[PDB]
Structure formats: C-alpha cells, structure tokens
C-alpha cells in the first residue's frame, strides 16, 4: 500500500497549486507564491497528522 502516499501527493500538489498560484504572467513562479506553496505543504501535512490522531482517539472509545 504505497499507492496511498502518491495519490495523496498529487492531491496535495494540485491543491497547493490551486490556492497558491494566482495570476499568470511568466512561466516561472513569483517569490510571493514560492513561499505560499512551501507553507501549504507544511500546513497541510501537519493537518493530516492531527486529523489522523483525532481519528485514532475514536476507536479507543468503542474498544
């Protein structure tokens, strides 16, 4: 099961591209956006972690 990381990797890239790259004038990322996507990665990553933890803290109750 490694087809999870890759799909999720694309799911991610797309997203960050969507929210971070606005207005196209040249074919090379603008610094302002450069950081945007960088963060979008950290943010999003932590997120999936937390959600993941909060998810585990569920099965405990029933078990």
């Amino acid at each position: 099961q490694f087809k999870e990381f890759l799909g999720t990797y694309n799911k991610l890239t797309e997203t960050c591209f969507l929210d971070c790259v606005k207005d196209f004038t040249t074919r090379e990322v603008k610094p302002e956006e450069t950081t945007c996507s960088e963060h979008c990665l950290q943010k999003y990553l932590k997120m999936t972690q937390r959600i993941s933890m909060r998810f585990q803290e569920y099965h405990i109750q029933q078990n």
């Binding site: 979008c40 950290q42 937390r50 959600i51």
Partner: protein, 64 residues
C-alpha cells in the same frame, strides 16, 4: 467482504479530510504553522463528521 469493509472506511477517511480541510484550513496559508484557531476547529470538524457518519449509518441500515 472484510477486504471491502475496511477499504471503504478509507474512502470515508479521505472524504472526511477533504471536508475538514475546507471547513477549517483557509486558502491563505499565512504561516506554515497551525494557528491555535485552525487547530481547534479541526478537532471538532473531525468529531462532528464521525458522528454524522455513525448516525447516517444507523438511520440508513435501519432503512434496509
């Protein structure tokens, strides 16, 4: 059947995330760190989601 039962609650998990990502993390990404706010929201959103899920199951299973 088991092979299924699990994989489904993996599709859910992804739908759920897609959800709470929208509901809680704004498309600004000011700082790569989770704002105290955004983090709290995210806890409840998961929580609230899972509920509507177990409840959606019953009211539904009870329909068959």
């Amino acid at each position: 059947a088991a092979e299924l039962e699990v994989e489904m609650m993996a599709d859910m998990y992804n739908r759920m995330t897609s959800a709470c990502h929208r509901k809680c993390v704004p498309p600004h990404y000011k700082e790569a760190e989770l704002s105290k706010g955004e983090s709290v929201c995210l806890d409840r959103c998961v929580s609230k989601y899972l509920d509507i899920h177990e409840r959606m199951g019953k009211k539904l299973t009870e329909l068959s």
